[PDB]
Structures are given as C-alpha cells and as structure tokens.
Paper text:
We identify the core polyadenylation complex within T. gondii and establish CPSF4 as a reader for m6A-modified mRNAs, via a YTH domain within its C-terminus, a feature which is shared with plants. In the CPSF complex, the T. gondii CPSF4 subunit can be distinguished as one holding a unique architecture which interestingly is shared with the plant CPSF30L family, and it constitutes a co-occurrence of three zinc fingers and a conserved YTH domain.
To validate the biochemical function of the YTH domain contained within CPSF4 (predicted from residues 434 to 598), we undertook to recombinantly express the domain in E. coli with an N-terminal TEV cleavable 8*His tag with minimized extremities so as to limit disordered regions and obtained pure and monodisperse preparation of the protein. TgCPSF4-YTH (aa 434–598), as used in the ITC experiments generated distinct crystal forms: Apo, m6A bound and m6A modified 7-mer RNA bound which all diffracted to high resolutions (up to 1.45 Å for the RNA bound form), sometimes using fully automated upstream crystal harvesting (using the EMBL crystal direct technology) and automated crystal diffraction (using MASSIF-1 at the ESRF). The binding of m6A favors crystal growth in P1 symmetry instead of a P41212 symmetry, however, the binding event does not induce important conformational changes within the protein, the N-terminal residues (ranging from 437 to 446) fold as random coils on opposite sides, most likely as a consequence of crystal packing. (C) Cartoon and stick superposition of the m6A-bound CPSF-4 YTH (green/yellow/blue) against the apo form (white) visualized in UCSF Chimera.
Author numbering: 433 to 589
The structure:
C-alpha cells in the first residue's frame, strides 16, 4: 500500500528484493518513467509482499555490473494499464508493469562489501543473487543505508 513513513525509518515493516536487469537501457527507462516488470513468478511474490509489508524495496543490479545501481520502492501492484508495451516484445514474457519510486542512484560494488553471504539464498555470495532474490532485513537495511551514503549519480546524464 501507500507509504506512511520514510523507508529508512525504523517503525515500518520492510522486505528487500534484488532485481537483475540484462540491459542498462531498461534501468534508464525505469528511472525515467518510474516503472518495472518482472517474471510472472516474481510478480506474484512481489505482489504478496506489496500488500502485506509497509515498504517493499527493490535493489537494482544490472547483469555483470558487479554491484548495485541504486534502489527503489514498489509503489503499486502489477497494472495492465501502466505504460503498456514499454519494454517491447519481452513484455509478452513478463508480468504486468508496476510503479517504482527510485530512492537512490549510486555505484557500489559487491566486492566493496567483502565476504557477504545471504542466509536466505543458501549462504551464497551477494554477487550470485538472481532476479527476485530476497535478502534478510538486517542485511537489506544495511545495503540501502550504505547505498544512500554514496554520492547520488545521475545515471541518465
């Protein structure tokens, strides 16, 4: 639902998901128009999180970028009327588009985090996260804090 506080404030419930993108151009489109889409399986998972969590955070990592480009809040359920067809033919293999509010654009490398593993993903290194991988709230909160502390990038510039 709607945000009733800042995503960094402690009293709200949060879930944190890693989003992978094969194309930087898709990230640029997401920043430009506040929109994302994911696989049908991830769409259901994110939908169930969206209705039952105060804030759903999406941590964006382009394939082979070596890290994160920023993070955003999921703002709506998948919506067939939101920017229909914006992604081109891949739209046909995805769930419906949903609104995203980008909350930080930055550069941070997985290797700057040292030996970080995800106990919710078989204790695998953060770099091996797949699209839709959930991270525990203590780690997710820290990743968003560390990203927020970095200088803001203007990735569209």
């Amino acid at each position: 639902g709607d945000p009733f506080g800042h995503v960094a404030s402690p009293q709200s419930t949060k879930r944190f998901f890693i989003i992978k993108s094969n194309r930087m151009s898709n990230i640029y489109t997401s920043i430009q128009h506040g929109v994302w889409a994911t696989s049908k399986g991830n769409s259901r998972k994110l939908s169930n999180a969206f209705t039952s969590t105060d804030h759903v955070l999406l941590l964006f990592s382009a394939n082979e970028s070596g890290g994160f480009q920023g993070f955003g809040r999921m703002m709506s359920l998948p919506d067939p009327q939101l920017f229909p067809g914006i992604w081109g033919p891949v739209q046909l293999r995805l769930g419906s588009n949903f609104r995203v509010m980008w909350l930080k654009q930055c550069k941070i490398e997985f290797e700057e985090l040292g030996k970080v593993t995800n106990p919710w993903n078989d204790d695998l290194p953060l770099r091996k996260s797949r699209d839709g991988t959930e991270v525990p709230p203590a780690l997710g909160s820290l990743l968003c804090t560390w990203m927020s502390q970095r200088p803001s990038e203007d990735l569209l510039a």
